[PDB]
Amino acid sequence: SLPREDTVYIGGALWGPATTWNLYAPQSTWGTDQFMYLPAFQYDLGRDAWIPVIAERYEFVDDKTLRIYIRPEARWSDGVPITADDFVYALELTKELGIGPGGGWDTYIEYVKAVDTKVVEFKAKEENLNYFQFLSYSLGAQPMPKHVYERIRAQMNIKDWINDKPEEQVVSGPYKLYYYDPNIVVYQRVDDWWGKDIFGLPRPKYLAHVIYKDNPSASLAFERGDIDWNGLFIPSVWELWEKKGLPVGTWYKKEPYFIPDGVGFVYVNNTKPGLSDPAVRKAIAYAIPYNEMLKKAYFGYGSQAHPSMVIDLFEPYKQYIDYELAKKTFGTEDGRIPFDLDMANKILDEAGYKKGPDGVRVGPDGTKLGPYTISVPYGWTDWMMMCEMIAKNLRSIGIDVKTEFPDFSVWADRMTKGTFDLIISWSVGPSFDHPFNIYRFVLDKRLSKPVGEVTWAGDWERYDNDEVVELLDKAVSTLDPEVRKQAYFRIQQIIYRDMPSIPAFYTAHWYEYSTKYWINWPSEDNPAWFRPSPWHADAWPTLFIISKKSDPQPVPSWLGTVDEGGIEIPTAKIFEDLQKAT
Ligand SMILES: OC[C@H]1O[C@@H](O[C@@H]2[C@@H](O)[C@H](O[C@@H]3[C@@H](O)[C@H](O[C@@H]4[C@@H](O)[C@H](O[C@@H]5[C@@H](O)[C@H](O)O[C@H](CO)[C@H]5O)O[C@H](CO)[C@H]4O)O[C@H](CO)[C@H]3O)O[C@H](CO)[C@H]2O)[C@H](O)[C@@H](O)[C@@H]1O
Ligand SMILES: [Ca+2]
Predict the structure, then answer these.
(1) Ligand lying closest to the C-alpha of residue 34
(2) How far is the C-alpha of 476 from the C-alpha of 132, rounded, in Å?
(3) 308 ligand 1 Cβ < 6 A
(4) Which structural domain range is residue 85 located in?
(5) Where do the Solute-binding protein family domain residues begin and end (predicted)?
C-alpha cells in the first residue's frame, strides 16, 4: 500500500531472493551497501572529485599518514554519534572474518587508529608502499556501527546475522529496510537522517524493488509504468520512446544508449583440470565471437574490451596500454584479440591437444577438455545468449561446454566460492586509480579465497601469481606516472602469457528511467551524476537529484567542485596535498 507518488520502483538490481542486510554475511541484499552504509568520502567518477560525506575534511600529516575528520553531525540512525571507533571496528572486523567492506586494507594500510572521537588516522604500510590503495581504503572507508555489531557477536556468529528487523536496523545512510517478502524489498527514508542539513533529504520516501523472475517480465513492468528507475538489459531500448511513445529515457538518446560500467569477463576457473592450462584459456579468447555477439545479443550497447584490461573508451587511460606489445601479440590494428577459430584450433594443436573419438580434446597428459559449464544467472537474457554463442564455438574446437542458468544466488555462490568452470561476470570500471583497480581486482591472489570459501573482493578465478603481487606492490611506490606505466606494461605481458581470464566486452551501465512520477533524472542532457544505475555501488546521489513531477526541486547545491560552488574535492587537489606533504 505504498504511496505511489512518494515511491520509486526499481528494476534490474535485485535478482533472486533477499538474503541479508549484513555486509559481513556471505551474501547481502541490493540496497544495503548502496543506501544503508555511506563512506567517509564518496568518489565522483563524473567529476573526478570526492564528496565529503561522513567525513568533512582530511589532512596529510605526512605523505604516508592521513587523518580524516568525521563530521560532528554524523550520527547513526539510532542517535549514536558516528565515531573513529566505528571506522577502526569496521576494518578490523573485515580482517578478522576474512570478509566485509574494505577487504585487503591490511595489505597496504599499516594501521587504522582512533586518535580522537571524530578523528581517524590511517598510516600507509611502507614495505609495499601504494599511494592509490592508501588513498582508496582511507578516503573510501565505510564505518560500521560498533555498538550494534558487538551486541550481535555476544549473541551469535556475525556471519549468520540477517539484520532484517526494520526497527533494529542502524544505518548511516538516508534509507533502511521497511518491509520484504519473496516478491519484493522495500526501503523507507530516514526523515531525521544526520545529513539532512548538509545534503538535504532524498526526495523519495520509499525505494521498492519487485522481484521479477527475468528480463522480459521486468521489461513489461517498465513498459506499463511500474518501474521508475531501471537497471535492465532491454532489447531495442529506443523503441520504447520512439515507436511506443512511452515517457521513458536513457543516458544517451542515440547509439550506445548507455555509458560504460566496466569490463565484463569470460572468467575461467584456474583450479580446474584443462582450464588450468594457459594455452586452453588463450584458445578460449580466440573463440569468442566478439563482434557478432556484441551486435546481436548485446545490441551494440557495449564494445569489445582491450585484452590489457584497460578501458580504452576513455582517452586518459590509453597511455597505460602497451599498444605495440598488444599489436605484436595479436596482430590487429589496436591489439584486440580477433575472433578466429583457426587460431584457437592451432593454439590447441600446438599445445598437444587432440580430439578424441567424441570430438572433445585430450591433452598430452591425458586431461580431457572436460564436461564444463558456462554459467550466468537465469533471466539475464543478453548474457544467456552470449553464453550460448560462446559455448557453441567452444564445442566446435573440442572443448565440451554447455550452458547452465541457475538462480542469481546459486550463481553468485559458485562464482564467489570458485566452484564454477566458466562464467561471464563483471570486474571493475573507470576510477581515479584505473588500470590498477582492475589488476588488483582480477589478478591478485591476496583478494582471493580457497575454493569453497566466499570472496567478493576479487580473483574469483583463483589465479595464482606472485610476480603480479610484487608488481602491484611497486606500481605506486611513487607518484611518478612512468613507474605506474611500466608496472602496467609488465602486467600486460603476464596477462597475454597466462590469459588468467578473458576481458571480453565493456559492460553497459544499465540505466533507464520513467518520467511518470519522477523528473530531472541524470542523463547526457542533465549530467548531474555519472553513476545513476540503481545497482551501482555509487548510485545514492541520484535520489537527491530527482524530484517529484508534481513539485520540481532544484539540483542540490553541494554537487560540483569547491571552485564551482559545490563541496566536492578534485582528485588533483588531493594529490597536490600529498605532494606538498613531503
Ligand atoms: O546484462 C546482464 C544483466 O545485467 C543486469 O544488471 C547487472 C546488475 O544487476 C549487477 O549488479 C551488481 C549486484 O549484483 C552486486 O550486488 C551487490 C553484491 O555484490 C554485494 O555483495 C557484497 C560485497 O560487494 C561486499 O564486499 O561485502 C558483502 C559481504 O556480505 C557483500 O554482500 O552486496 C550488495 C548490497 O550490499 C549488492 O548490491 O553489486 C554490484 C555493485 O558492486 C552490482 O554491480 O551488475 C552487473 C554489472 O555488470 C549488471 O550487469 C541486468 O539487470 C539484467 O537485465 C541483464 O541481463
Ligand atoms: Ca556503501
Answers:
(1) 2
(2) 7
(3) no
(4) 37-155+190-201+557-582
(5) 51-444
- Residue closest by Cα to atom 12 of ligand 1: 535
Q: Domains in the chain: how many in total?
A: 3
Domain C-terminal end among 480, 508, 536: 508
CA distances to 288, 380, 401, 464 from 294, rounded to whole Å, are 10, 15, 20, 30
Q: Which of the ligands is closest to the CA of residue 37?
A: 2
Report DSSP state, residue 302. Answer: S
Name 319's Cβ contacts closer than 8 Å, sequence gap at least 6: 481, 485
Which residue, 362, 424, 372, is CA-closest to 395? 372
My answer on whether 221 and 289 are in the same domain is: no
394 and 347 in contact (C-beta within 8 Å)? no
Q: Are residues 543 and 561 in the same domain?
A: no
Query: Which of 508, 541, 566 is the endpoint of a domain?
Result: 508
Measured CA to CA, the distance from residue 19 to residue 180 in angstroms comes to 10
Phi and psi at residue 361, in whole multiples of 5°? -60, 150
Determination approach: X-ray
C-alpha cell at 390: 560462446
Nearest to 212 by CA among 83, 383, 30: 30
Same domain, 503 and 561: no
